[PDB]
């Protein structure tokens, strides 16, 4: 509701990015994880320039689609983990009262310029009173995989954080048929000292 | 497009290799929780 990362139409239940290694059985690390009091609110204008702007842009998207579908997530990614059979995946799960076809676009930008986009169409499955959308053990772009290597290979965490300053990920999920925007989640990262997050309603 | 190199030089090189002058997050009006991981 106002407590969760959700709009009138689409509700994120799960998100997680991960590395799993094999060997008879399998073992894996969470780089991130959310799983579903009001949420606090961030001034959308305060992050505009950390995402692509003129034209097909965040500013544009916000003004247009419903202002109840825009969120900012702050992750503290856990990087403490160990090369052979490594799979780097990301899974997520959404819920909806209604049956749709969702386009999910996810943009990795740096310095506000997009450097890589990934787009997947997702269909619904009826379970209980509603419909579920599961993206499953996606794979994670080589870009990101390298990013993580270069990161982990840094003398001190705070240097990592410092580099992350200009790394963001915009994730826009729309309705295929009605190009209505169902969810827009902005992501900004730091490395934990130990994995955690704060979720914010974006406002203006 | 190893636009990822420019991510590391901006901080690590640090202002020889050219990326735009950028304003870090602790300097914007965001809530306080924004830098206080929970436990």
Quote the CA–CA distance of A119 and A121 in Å, as a whole number.
Answer: 7
Q: Which residues contact A31 (CB under 8 A, 6 or more apart)?
A: A16, A17, A18, A19, A77, A78, A79, A148, A195
Q: Do A188 and A48 form a contact (C-beta atoms < 8 A)?
A: no
Cα separations in angstroms, A189 against A77, A122, A129, B20: 7, 26, 35, 20
Among residues A100, A165, A109, the alpha carbon closest in space to that of A141 is found at A109
Q: Say what angle helices A142-152 and A157-164 make with each other, to 10 degrees.
A: 140
Quote the CA–CA distance of B24 and B39 in Å, as a whole number.
Answer: 24
Q: Do A94 and A10 form a contact (C-beta atoms < 8 A)?
A: yes
DSSP A47: T
Domains of chain A, residue spans: 1-204
CATH number 3.30.110.30 given to A1-204: no
Q: What is the resolution of this structure in A?
A: 3.0
* DSSP reduced 3-state for A79: coil
Number of domains in chain B: 1
The residue among A115, A147, A148 with the most chain B CBs within 10 A of its CB, best to mutate, is A115
Alpha helices in A17-111, H assignment, sequence order: 58-64
- For A:66-125, CB contacts with B below 8 A are 74, 76, 110-111, 113, 115
Containing domain of residue B12, as a range? 5-35
Joined together, the tokens standing for residue A61 give 């998207």
B19/A200 Cβ within 8 A: no
């Amino acid at each position: 509701s106002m407590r969760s990362i959700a709009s009138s139409k689409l509700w994120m239940l799960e998100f997680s990015a991960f590395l799993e290694r094999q060997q008879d059985p399998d073992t894996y690390n969470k780089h991130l994880f959310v799983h579903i009091p009001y949420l606090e609110t961030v001034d959308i204008r305060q992050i505009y320039d950390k995402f692509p702007e003129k034209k097909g842009g965040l500013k544009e998207l916000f003004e247009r689609g419903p202002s109840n579908a825009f969120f900012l997530v702050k992750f503290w990614a856990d990087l403490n983990t160990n090369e052979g059979s490594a799979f780097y995946g990301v899974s997520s799960q959404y819920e909806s009262p209604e049956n749709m076809i969702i386009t999910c676009s996810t943009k990795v930008c740096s310095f506000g310029k997009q450097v890589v986009e990934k787009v997947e169409t997702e269909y619904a499955r009826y379970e209980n009173g509603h419909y579920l959308y599961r993206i499953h053990r996606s794979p994670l772009c080589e870009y990101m995989i390298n990013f993580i290597h270069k990161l982990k290979h840094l003398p001190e965490k705070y240097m990592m954080n410092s580099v992350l300053e200009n790394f963001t990920i915009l994730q826009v999920v729309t309705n295929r048929d009605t190009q209505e925007t169902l969810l827009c989640i902005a992501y900004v990262f730091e490395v934990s000292a130990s994995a955690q997050h704060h979720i914010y309603r974006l406002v203006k | 497009e190893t636009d990822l190199e420019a991510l590391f030089n901006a901080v690590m090189n640090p202002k020889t290799a050219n990326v735009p002058q950028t304003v870090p997050m602790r300097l914007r009006k965001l809530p306080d929780s924004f830098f206080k991981p929970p436990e």
